[PDB]
Design a protein around this nucleic acid. Structure first.
Length: 60
DNA sequence: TAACTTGAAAGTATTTCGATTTCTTGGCTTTATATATCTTGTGGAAAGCGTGCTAACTTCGGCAGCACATATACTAA
């Protein structure tokens, strides 16, 4: 893995990690967040969505 | 040697006044279902500087270059 990933998904993951580190959440929280983000990205409706949509996806 | 009528002197009280609070209005958010269409929100796959120190031994150990010497072929007498 980490090779069949788009630049948009990579930016989303990096934003997730950045917000996690800003809120100072543990690495377990970081891992759970990235896992849930990947699980949500698996779907196509969220995959091909808006920029604000994917930002709110990071947030949620 | 007191007693009552003086005066400007306090609190003290209540009455209104500035102001901030409380009470009214809308209106949007959200729940589902599908009905339908413009441009512009993206997914994704490409592809056109910069340091320091040696950590020191051994014994290479080669080649760089160089370079010195000379044996030989060319030339003047």
């Amino acid at each position: 893995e980490n090779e069949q990933v788009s630049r948009s998904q990579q930016r989303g993951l990096r934003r997730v990690r950045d917000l996690c580190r800003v809120l100072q959440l543990p690495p377990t929280f970081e891992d759970t967040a990235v896992a849930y983000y990947q699980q949500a990205y698996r779907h196509s409706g969220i995959r091909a969505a808006r920029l604000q949509k994917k930002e709110v996806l990071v947030g949620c």
